[PDB]
Amino acid sequence: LVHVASVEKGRSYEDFQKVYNAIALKLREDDEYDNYIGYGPVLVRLAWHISGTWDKHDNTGGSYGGTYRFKKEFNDPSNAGLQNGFKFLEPIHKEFPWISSGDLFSLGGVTAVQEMQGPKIPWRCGRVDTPEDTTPDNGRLPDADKDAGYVRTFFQRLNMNDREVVALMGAHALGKTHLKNSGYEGPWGAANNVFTNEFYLNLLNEDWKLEKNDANNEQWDSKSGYMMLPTDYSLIQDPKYLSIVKEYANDQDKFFKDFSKAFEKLLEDGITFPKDAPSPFIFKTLEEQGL
Numbered sequence: 001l002v003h004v005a006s007v008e009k010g011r012s013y014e015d016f017q018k019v020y021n022a023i024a025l026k027l028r029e030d031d032e033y034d035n036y037i038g039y040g041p042v043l044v045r046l047a048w049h050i051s052g053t054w055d056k057h058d059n060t061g062g063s064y065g066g067t068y069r070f071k072k073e074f075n076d077p078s079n080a081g082l083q084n085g086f087k088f089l090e091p092i093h094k095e096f097p098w099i100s101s102g103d104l105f106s107l108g109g110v111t112a113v114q115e116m117q118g119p120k121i122p123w124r125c126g127r128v129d130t131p132e133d134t135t136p137d138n139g140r141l142p143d144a145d146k147d148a149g150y151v152r153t154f155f156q157r158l159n160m161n162d163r164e165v166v167a168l169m170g171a172h173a174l175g176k177t178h179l180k181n182s183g184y185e186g187p188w189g190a191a192n193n194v195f196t197n198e199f200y201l202n203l204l205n206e207d208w209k210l211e212k213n214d215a216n217n218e219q220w221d222s223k224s225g226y227m228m229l230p231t232d233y234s235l236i237q238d239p240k241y242l243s244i245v246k247e248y249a250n251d252q253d254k255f256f257k258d259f260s261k262a263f264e265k266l267l268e269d270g271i272t273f274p275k276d277a278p279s280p281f282i283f284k285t286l287e288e289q290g291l
């Protein structure tokens with residue numbers, strides 16, 4: 001399996017910037033979502049979910065194919081709640097029908113992060129919609145009631161090392177868990193719609209109590225009213241993870257750089273970019289454009 005990136009016929013950066021801007025404008029507009037959190041977080045999760053199905057062993061899954069659009073993947077239990085992100089993007093697609101699905105899903109994640117004050121994430125176009133037949137089976141996404149060993153092992157399937165894993169996990173500063181969706185309830189911090197290193201700070205500074213939730217699952221609860229998943233928690237239980245956690249808790253800049261690189265990589269896994277492919281684009285935020 002080889003997935004070669006093929007630029008949408010006759011489209012350029014400017015063409016992408018527009019899709020970006022549309023998404024960005026809509027985020028700005030549809031702010032009531034999830035008790036005023038906004039769709040930022042959900043879009044970041046969508047991009048990660050369409051990308052986390054990848055399997056470095058046989059190259060199946062990953063963002064390339066836009067397979068999320070198919071029932072199999074769409075109805076994946078680990079995907080519960082992602083439909084709100086889809087529905088959000090649907091009109092955008094209608095407006096820009098020439099964009100491939102994988103390109104759209106992934107671009108919304110990039111837009112989200114940058115509009116939420118995150119770092120700039122270089123992005124590449126070229127994903128090609130694939131047939132229903134290429135939809136990976138359910139079960140490729142990670143479970144939350146596990147530990148560091150599970151996490152290390154899991155992430156390896158996507159080629160991510162310790163550092164990448166910790167960086168990537170800081171995405172948990174955003175949004176929250178929802179009982180009805182995953183069997184977990186509560187946010188991980190206070191500024192849930194702004195990109196910061198809050199995650200690490202929380203993990204290291206709160207007084208966490210393990211408790212069972214209404215779904216009968218364990219989670220670490222803080223007095224402040226925050227929560228952490230077992231998998232999140234495991235980042236402080238593991239010696240190697242822990243020092244990275246500390247480094248990020250100490251330097252947001254470092255965090256941002258590392259996050260940026262890992263996120264791109266995560267979104268570009270399983271894809272082959274020809275020599276003549278354009279460089280990755282760095283989009284301007286609304287604010288940078290005075291819009």
Ligand code: CCH
Binds near residue numbers: 042045176178182
């Ligand atoms: C870089 C992206 C990223 C990584 C990587 C990543 C990795 C992990 N995630 Fe996550 N995720 C976000 C981004 C990332 N997460 C974001 C953002 C959300 C918030 C969504 C929302 O607020 O609707 C978000 C929500 C949840 C939910 C809540 C679902 C609900 O709505 O009820 C669960 C459970 C959960 C489980 C795990 C586990 C397990 C892992 C890996 O081990 N994540």
